[PDB]
Amino acid sequence: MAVKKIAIFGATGQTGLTTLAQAVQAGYEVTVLVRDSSRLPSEGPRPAHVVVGDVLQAADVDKTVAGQDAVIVLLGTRNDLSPTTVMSEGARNIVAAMKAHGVDKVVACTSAFLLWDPTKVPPRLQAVTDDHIRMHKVLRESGLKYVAVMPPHIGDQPLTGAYTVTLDGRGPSRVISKHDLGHFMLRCLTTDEYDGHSTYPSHQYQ
Amino acid sequence: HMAVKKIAIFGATGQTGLTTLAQAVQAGYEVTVLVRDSSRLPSEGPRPAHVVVGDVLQAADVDKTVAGQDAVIVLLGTRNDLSPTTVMSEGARNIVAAMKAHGVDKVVACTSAFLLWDPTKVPPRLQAVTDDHIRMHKVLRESGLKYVAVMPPHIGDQPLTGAYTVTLDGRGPSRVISKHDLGHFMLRCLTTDEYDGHSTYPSHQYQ
Numbered sequence: 001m002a003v004k005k006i007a008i009f010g011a012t013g014q015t016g017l018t019t020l021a022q023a024v025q026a027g028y029e030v031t032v033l034v035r036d037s038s039r040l041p042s043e044g045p046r047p048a049h050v051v052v053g054d055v056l057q058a059a060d061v062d063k064t065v066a067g068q069d070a071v072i073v074l075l076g077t078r079n080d081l082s083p084t085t086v087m088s089e090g091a092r093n094i095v096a097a098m099k100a101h102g103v104d105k106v107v108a109c110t111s112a113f114l115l116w117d118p119t120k121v122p123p124r125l126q127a128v129t130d131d132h133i134r135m136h137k138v139l140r141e142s143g144l145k146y147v148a149v150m151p152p153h154i155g156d157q158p159l160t161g162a163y164t165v166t167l168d169g170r171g172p173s174r175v176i177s178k179h180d181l182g183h184f185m186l187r188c189l190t191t192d193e194y195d196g197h198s199t200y201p202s203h204q205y206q
Numbered sequence: 207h208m209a210v211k212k213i214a215i216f217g218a219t220g221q222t223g224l225t226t227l228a229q230a231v232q233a234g235y236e237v238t239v240l241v242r243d244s245s246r247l248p249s250e251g252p253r254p255a256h257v258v259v260g261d262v263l264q265a266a267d268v269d270k271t272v273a274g275q276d277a278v279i280v281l282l283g284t285r286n287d288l289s290p291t292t293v294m295s296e297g298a299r300n301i302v303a304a305m306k307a308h309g310v311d312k313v314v315a316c317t318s319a320f321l322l323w324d325p326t327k328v329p330p331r332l333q334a335v336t337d338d339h340i341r342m343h344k345v346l347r348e349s350g351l352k353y354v355a356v357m358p359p360h361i362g363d364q365p366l367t368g369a370y371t372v373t374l375d376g377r378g379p380s381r382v383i384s385k386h387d388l389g390h391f392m393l394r395c396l397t398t399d400e401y402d403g404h405s406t407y408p409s410h411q412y413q
């Protein structure tokens with residue numbers, strides 16, 4: 001296929017695990033970056049290549065980005081709402097590696113709160129949102145072919161492929177299943193129509 | 207007050223520096239910049255009147271930049287430092303000494319809104335630069351110079367509005383200021399004494 005080799009950052013995470021499973025089923029040759037302490041589960045889908053290391057190390061990000069057709073970014077801090085720069089600094093490393101290695105397409109997940117009135121963002125989520133804002137600025141200013149995926153609440157509902165994709169604004173539902181979010185990140189590999197846009201995927205599960 | 211025409215800008219090649227410099231040149235200021243590498247200044251459009259090539263850590267280079275000015279704008283930063291660093295505070299000591307030696311009495315300097323919030327708001331990677339912002343702020347406050355402390359939140363890329371809010375000695379209502387609005391505010395601080403001795407938090411809601 002046109003896009004065949006992809007790097008996934010955050011493959012062990014809630015959305016990353018289903019994105020990886022869908023990508024392997026769809027025939028992608030997937031490279032993952034995993035932290036040493038948190039490898040992919042034994043019984044699950046196996047990627048083609050594993051780099052062990054940290055997104056905060058340029059060397060490890062370089063190893064993961066080299067030779068790819070595109071990059072998916074599903075970094076996050078799991079339940080931890082503390083102040084952080086891991087997403088934005090990870091994105092700085094990813095941008096630098098993509099430029100050095102001639103990779104252009106990056107589909108990266110931040111949050112629908114980037115499209116909210118800031119007075120309404122829940123204060124408990126402001127520290128994480130501040131880093132999503134930093135991350136989105138890094139990716140927007142890079143000049144790369146960047147699809148800004150900005151989901152609302154990530155739920156455990158099924159894969160449908162039937163969700164709404166709202167461009168450059170908030171969508172009509174406040175949930176997307178983790179499986180649909182991963183499906184959309186992969187869909188963004190096969191089209192240029194979302195490049196340079198913010199995208200809000202959402203659905204009503206019924 | 208005293209009419210400011212000549213200014214030095216430190217950090218003029220940075221993201222806020224570049225637009226503060228452009229806006230200052232367009233408004234008519236006679237601008238002197240201290241730059242480590244003159245190729246980082248734009249070759250077209252508005253250009254400063256005077257370029258000193260050198261380093262804020264070298265007292266002589268700072269002295270040459272501050273000589274003859276009416277006021278000083280400080281937009282230094284060290285984005286890549288994540289462990290203890292003293293570049294900004296040592297630069298500020300050199301700036302203060304040069305201002306005292308040359309009779310320059312007005313300094314408008316950028317640190318960050320972390321200095322207005324609980325220290326646990328600081329991401330761990332940013333503790334070292336925040337600690338050095340605190341040292342720089344203390345150097346400027348203890349100098350006896352007329353000092354406006356500008357303590358912005360996230361610096362964004364939205365177009366200049368001139369319509370942002372400034373909150374005095376406290377935090378305002380948004381957590382972003384465009385680099386263009388931040389630069390506009392630094393220049394506004396040259397036209398008035400009202401912020402002298404205060405901390406200022408510029409912020410705005412864009413679109």
Ligand SMILES: NC(=O)c1ccc[n+]([C@@H]2O[C@H](COP(=O)([O-])OP(=O)(O)OC[C@H]3O[C@@H](n4cnc5c(N)ncnc54)[C@H](OP(=O)(O)O)[C@@H]3O)[C@@H](O)[C@H]2O)c1
Nearest residue numbers: 010012013014015035038054055075076077078111153154
């Ligand atoms: N409702 C929601 O939960 C919601 C809504 C909107 C937006 N979001 C945002 O959507 C994104 C994805 O959320 P999610 O729930 O799928 O993610 P998650 O479960 O928090 O997974 C985060 C992933 O990032 C990896 N990671 C973290 N730090 C890393 C580091 N230093 N180096 C390498 N990898 C690192 C994690 O690896 P480890 O296995 O080593 O931890 C894991 O694979 C997040 O940014 C989140 O804030 C979430």
Ligand SMILES: NC(=O)c1ccc[n+]([C@@H]2O[C@H](COP(=O)([O-])OP(=O)(O)OC[C@H]3O[C@@H](n4cnc5c(N)ncnc54)[C@H](OP(=O)(O)O)[C@@H]3O)[C@@H](O)[C@H]2O)c1
Nearest residue numbers: 217218219220221222242261262282283285318359360361
């Ligand atoms: N980014 C944010 O959202 C944010 C938020 C709050 C506060 N801040 C703080 O706001 C301030 C301005 O940030 P910014 O992003 O506009 O700055 P920046 O883009 O990082 O620019 C830093 C400037 O300082 C110069 N500089 C650094 N070391 C120097 C040295 N030894 N001698 C002479 N010049 C030196 C740099 O010169 P070169 O071009 O030669 O490197 C550049 O002109 C910083 O102190 C920052 O910590 C940033």
Ligand SMILES: O=C(O)c1cc(/N=N/c2ccc(O)c(C(=O)O)c2)ccc1O
Nearest residue numbers: 078079080111112113128151152153174
């Ligand atoms: O731990 C968490 O609770 C958490 C929640 C997050 N985001 N939640 C969102 C984001 C955007 C939204 O629009 C909505 C919504 O509409 O409810 C919810 C992100 C990281 C987290 O760790």
Ligand SMILES: O=C(O)c1cc(/N=N/c2ccc(O)c(C(=O)O)c2)ccc1O
Nearest residue numbers: 130284285318319320335358359360381
């Ligand atoms: O290296 C950098 O990029 C850097 C970034 C800084 N950011 N400071 C703040 C302060 C308050 C805020 O609210 C926010 C925000 O909301 O993003 C950011 C400070 C020093 C640095 O060296």
